[PDB]
């Protein structure tokens, strides 16, 4: 019946929202450019069906992240009131509340830091094509080992997307986005099957061999 | 007309709640019995990986079908705990829902038919082991080749589960604006990735050349 509100201060990432549209256009450019780095020099990589899978999970993130902008344009009316004197009385007390914080920078670390991480991630991708041209001193060896070696670093740089992804859904949990902890795990248990499935090819798949691999046996039996 | 009674003065769809709980305890029996039929005759194991996945999606289906019981026990009961208000359009709206039917017997086809389909489905499972006990072949052929033949009927008998599934989540959309559904396509596009992935192994498996050539190998060893 008589209950006041608690911390009902209307304030969100409206400042970063402007960048939300700039990131949507960048996702379409780097999306196709990253896949060309390898196939750019060579004609057609036989194992190109691998890089083709990740390209599917990248199209679902950019169109959904937009949900942060539509939530702001709908929540607080952008055309509420411009800047003018008039007779303000309710907003007058809004200033007495910040007199206890005395820290306006609190909102600055939210935008300023974003511009930094924004570029730190873009350079984290080009490191793959720049690592080949800048340096490349390898003798005649099975180039395939490099194709399956990429998996190693990938499995790691990949989790950076999953972890940062769930944290976005668990945040909305505050008000009432859904109910009963469920569904969420759909992407953790599902990514596990498509992952463990690739192993059946490493154990059942027949590997190759050469004159150097057979010579390594002499050093193995040497153990006594 | 002296209150002779008979058995029950009601036949609402809720009458199915009785079998709803009987199914939860029933799967526990067919669950392990169906998996033993094949490995029971085989003195050794091997294809336990293909059978371990199909059994995973079956554990989450039965615990969710219960959503129909907890919904009927609350709905007809006190839905709004605190004093919300009173009756809503559900009273005047029931007028259009009452014309949908014509006779009271219409409620009998709801249960009387459920018992019929309840048996026709139980015989579709045992048909695989009862088909082997028959034993009617003097000569013997490659067994591993038959292990991949089941994939011709399975994928078909499986779709019977997917269709009946979305039909349950799509029916709620009728009168339920609140608590919308997450994303039905979540599973279709997902069931396709884990599916097409199984083909990558069929392209590498090059044991036989063709169905007619496989039988020609018997005469090939005869000629020199």
The length of chain B, given as a count of residues: 224
Domain hosting residue A152, numbered range: 143-206
Contact B110, B11 (CB under 8 A): yes
Distances in whole angstroms, Cα of residue B34 to Cα of each of A85, B45, B128: 78, 16, 9
Least CA distance to B180: which residue of chain A?
A: A178
Report the first-to-last Cα separation within chain A, whole angstroms. 85
Answer yes or no: is B5 within a domain.
no
- Which residue shows structure tokens 């959503």? B67
Q: d(Cα A11, Cα A76) in Å, to the nearest integer?
A: 9
Answer yes or no: is B149 within a domain.
yes
Assess A49–B contact: CB distance below 8 Å, yes or no.
yes
Least CA distance to A189: which residue of chain B?
A: B56
DSSP 3-state of B141 = coil
- Contact list in B for residue A186 (CB cut-off 8 A) is 186
Q: Are residues B23 and B115 in the same domain?
A: yes
Assess A190–B contact: CB distance below 8 Å, yes or no.
yes
Answer yes or no: is B2 within a domain.
no
Q: Are residues B118 and B159 in the same domain?
A: no
Beta-carbon separation of B201 and A197 below 8 A: no
- CA distance, residue B100 to nearest chain A CA (Å): 33
Q: Are residues B114 and B193 in the same domain?
A: no
| Contacts made by residues A41-49, CB under 8 angstroms, sequence distance 24+ | A45/A147, A47/A147, A49/B200
Q: Are residues B148 and B45 in the same domain?
A: no
Q: Are residues B109 and B152 in the same domain?
A: no
Q: Which of A162, A106, A190 is nearest to B53 (CA)?
A: A190
Burial A136-149 (b: 16+ CB within 10 A, else e): eeeeeeeeeeeeee
DSSP 3-state of B157 = helix
- Which residue shows structure tokens 């371990």? B52
Helix (H) or strand (E) holding B33: helix B17-41
From the CB of residue B118, how many other CB atoms can be counted at a distance below 10 Å?
Answer: 13
Q: Are residues B34 and B119 in the same domain?
A: yes
From the CB of residue A77, how many other CB atoms can be counted at a distance below 10 Å?
Answer: 8
Answer yes or no: is B52 within a domain.
yes
**How many separate domains does chain A show?**
2
> DSSP letters of B191-223?
HHHHHHHHHHHHHH--S-S-HHHHHHHHHHTT-
Q: d(Cα B190, Cα B192) in Å, to the nearest integer?
A: 5
Q: Are residues B112 and B183 in the same domain?
A: no
- Domain-terminating residue out of A59, A76, A93: A76
Distances in whole angstroms, Cα of residue B174 to Cα of each of B126, B168, B169, B178: 37, 11, 10, 11
- Contact list in B for residue A56 (CB cut-off 8 A) is 193
Answer yes or no: is A45 within a domain.
yes
Q: Are residues B54 and B154 in the same domain?
A: no
Q: d(Cα A190, Cα A195) in Å, to the nearest integer?
A: 9
Answer yes or no: is B217 within a domain.
no
Method: NMR
Q: Which of A80, A70, A72 is nearest to A15 (CA)?
A: A72
Residues 6+ apart with CB under 8 A from A40: A129
Radius of gyration of chain B (CA): 26
Q: Are residues B151 and B189 in the same domain?
A: yes
Q: Which of A17, A11, A136 is nearest to A68 (CA)?
A: A17
Q: Are residues B123 and B39 in the same domain?
A: yes
Q: Are residues B165 and B120 in the same domain?
A: no
Q: Which of A113, A164, A60 is nearest to B193 (CA)?
A: A60
From the CB of residue B126, how many other CB atoms can be counted at a distance below 10 Å?
Answer: 13
Answer yes or no: is A184 within a domain.
yes
Q: Are residues B70 and B124 in the same domain?
A: yes
Answer yes or no: is B94 within a domain.
no
């Amino acid at each position: 019946m008589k209950i006041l509100t608690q911390d009902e201060i209307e304030a969100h990432r409206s400042h970063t929202l402007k960048g939300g549209i700039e990131g949507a256009l960048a996702g379409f450019a780097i999306s196709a450019i990253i896949f060309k780095v390898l196939p750019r020099r060579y004609p057609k990589f036989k194992p190109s069906t691998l890089t083709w899978s990740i390209k599917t999970a990248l199209w679902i993130t950019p169109p959904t992240v937009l949900t942060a902008i539509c939530a702001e344009e709908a929540s607080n009316n952008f055309d509420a009131t411009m800047y003018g004197s008039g007779s303000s009385s309710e907003d007058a007390l809004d200033e007495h509340r910040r007199w206890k914080s005395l820290s306006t920078k609190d909102k600055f670390v939210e935008g300023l830091s974003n511009n930094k991480y924004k570029i730190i991630t873009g350079a984290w991708a080009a490191s793959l094509y720049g690592s080949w041209v800048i340096v490349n001193k390898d003798p005649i060896m099975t180039k395939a080992q490099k194709i399956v070696q990429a998996r190693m670093y990938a499995q790691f740089i990949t989790v950076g997307l999953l972890l940062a992804s769930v944290g976005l859904s668990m945040y909305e949990n505050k008000l009432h986005p859904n109910k009963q902890k469920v569904n969420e795990m759909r992407r953790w248990e599902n990514a596990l099957r498509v992952a463990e499935e690739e192993e059946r090819l490493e154990k059942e798949g027949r590997r190759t061999g050469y004159v150097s691999n057979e010579e390594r046996i002499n050093s193995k039996i040497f153990k006594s």
